[PDB]
Amino acid sequence: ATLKDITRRLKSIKNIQKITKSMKMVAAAKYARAERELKPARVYGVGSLALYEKA
Amino acid sequence: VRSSAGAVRDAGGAFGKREQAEEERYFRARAKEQLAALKKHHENEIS
Amino acid sequence: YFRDNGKHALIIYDDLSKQAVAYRQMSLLLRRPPGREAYPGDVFYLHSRLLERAAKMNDAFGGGSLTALPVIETQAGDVSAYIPTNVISITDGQIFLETELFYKGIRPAINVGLSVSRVGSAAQTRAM
């Protein structure tokens, strides 16, 4: 394309990359919290399933 | 060469149209809801 | 001649982007200095003086008319080029044909989003 087409496309992709990096960071934080909260719920749910696999 | 705010919709590529539609559908839905509420308020305030 | 004798005419230049090239060749072989993209300086004039003859005479001058439909050819949709922009700023309306619409099945490819016509309301039958 022409120079302006390339410039606009490059700016758009740079914005997209910035946004995806930020979202990766947010998702990583939420993941850490989710694992932390998943351990106790893991034991709780496994216990609740205990009966059916035992009987 | 840098990047600036509101550039995704300045390029007008696929992401620009995708974003425009993602906005328009949502705000059409909310406009419909608000119009329904406005009609309800109109009827309830006649008396 | 037709528009001056009370009749109506339609003229279709096809293309004007090749008249521009022929004029550039002439001007370069007469040794006149080139301009932008090597086109002479008088490349807007070339077309403006030509498309300004498509008039709509009043009833005192016969009432005849001469419509014009110049055809331009862009390069990969670069409407921003030199001759395309000149002729776009010369003409009244536009009819943008796009290859992405041609292959998507929309034929004629007229891009109704960008196509314009200053007359618009006027020059349209009441039913239409």
Short mmCIF file of C-alpha atoms in Angstrom, two decimals, chain C residues 3 7 9 50-58 63-68:
data_model
loop_
_atom_site.label_atom_id
_atom_site.label_comp_id
_atom_site.label_asym_id
_atom_site.label_seq_id
_atom_site.Cartn_x
_atom_site.Cartn_y
_atom_site.Cartn_z
CA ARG C 3 -26.79 20.48 -26.04
CA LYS C 7 -31.26 18.21 -27.62
CA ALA C 9 -26.52 14.22 -25.01
CA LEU C 50 -13.17 19.44 -20.29
CA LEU C 51 -15.70 18.40 -17.66
CA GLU C 52 -16.97 21.96 -17.24
CA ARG C 53 -18.60 21.74 -20.67
CA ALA C 54 -21.21 19.27 -19.39
CA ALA C 55 -23.86 21.87 -18.62
CA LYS C 56 -27.66 21.99 -18.40
CA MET C 57 -28.79 24.92 -20.50
CA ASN C 58 -31.79 26.92 -19.38
CA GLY C 63 -32.90 23.75 -22.80
CA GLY C 64 -30.46 21.12 -24.02
CA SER C 65 -28.10 19.27 -21.73
CA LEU C 66 -24.89 17.24 -21.86
CA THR C 67 -24.26 14.65 -19.15
CA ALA C 68 -20.73 13.35 -18.64
#
